[PDB]
Amino acid sequence: TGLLDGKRILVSGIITDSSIAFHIARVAQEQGAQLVLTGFDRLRLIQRITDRLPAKAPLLELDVQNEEHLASLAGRVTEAIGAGNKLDGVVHSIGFMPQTGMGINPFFDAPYADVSKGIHISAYSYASMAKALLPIMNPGGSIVGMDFDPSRAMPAYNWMTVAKSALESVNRFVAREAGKYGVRSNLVAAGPIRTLAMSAIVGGALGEEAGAQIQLLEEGWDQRAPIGWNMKDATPVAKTVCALLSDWLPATTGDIIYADGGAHTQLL
Known part of the structure; x- marks a missing residue:
């Protein structure tokens, strides 16, 4: 039987059925986990998407930029999983960078306000989610965030790369805080995945140079990968x-x- 049997796990970041978060949730459920889901903004759409998951699971609202949503998140989760219960797991699968800091726009022409908003959502929010949810986590538990290796510069990804560099640093401090609770904190640095968003770029939505650049990255990725990459x-x-x-x-x-x-x- 299941790898996550009898674990209670919070999974953020589902927006479509091609979301990495969607698949995380699916696999986790396939493995016996009991889930609590969070969503941003498009809650009606998300609810419809999450009905396609193997099992029913409560859907809660969370805009990570909302200080009220965060302050109330712990209480709202406890209600959904029942009092006297705690979380064994938390999944941060959230990222955002305005098209001004990522894509076709030159590196230098990204205005700080846009950059700041992307760091807020993509890096700082990892810390604030941890703050909100640690008090309701069990020992032995685990916090996981999604990373894309930023240790080297690359075309296009631009300020989102900077955000991921920031997120990695953040994860090391969050571990310090999380350890006090017997809780681990880690990032999964994934290879490139064709989300709906990504698929549109490949199909030319951000121009032919951009489509060509993502296509070089992917082909080179699978080449380099000793076990290949899909x-x-x-x-x-x-x-x-x-x-x-x-x-x-x-x-x-x-x-x-x-x-x-x-x-x-x-x-x-």
Whole structure:
């Protein structure tokens, strides 16, 4: 039976059925986890999407930029899972960068307000979610966030790369706080995944140069990866998250696990 059996896990970041978060939730549920889901803004759409998951699960609202949503999140979760119960797991699968700081726009022409909003949502929110939810987490529990390796610069990704560099630093401090509760904190640095958003870029929505750049990155990724890399398949990364959520990596924290086919270990 299941890898996450009898675990209570909060999963953020579902927006479509091609969301990495969607697959994380699916696999987790397939593995016996009992879930609490969170969503931003488009709650009617999200509710419809999440009905396509294997099992029923409460959907709660969370705009990570809303100080009231965060302050109330713990109480609202406890209500959904029942009093006298706590969370074993939390999944941060949230990211955003205005098109001004990421894509076709030059690196220098991103105005700070846009940059700041992206860091807020993509990095700081990892800390604020942890603050909100640690008091209602069990020992042995696990917090997991989604990363994209920012240790080297690349075209297009631009300020989102900077946000991921920030998020990695954030995760190391959150581990310090999380350790006090017997709770681990880690990032999964995933390889490129064809989300709906990504698929549109590949199809030319951000121009032919941008479409060409993403296509070079993907082809080179699969080449470099010793076991290959399938941009269309989010399942291997979801399993990696489930692994970190499980009891089978109990000594790992403040750390980054790479679900990228080994590509980052190879120059070419």
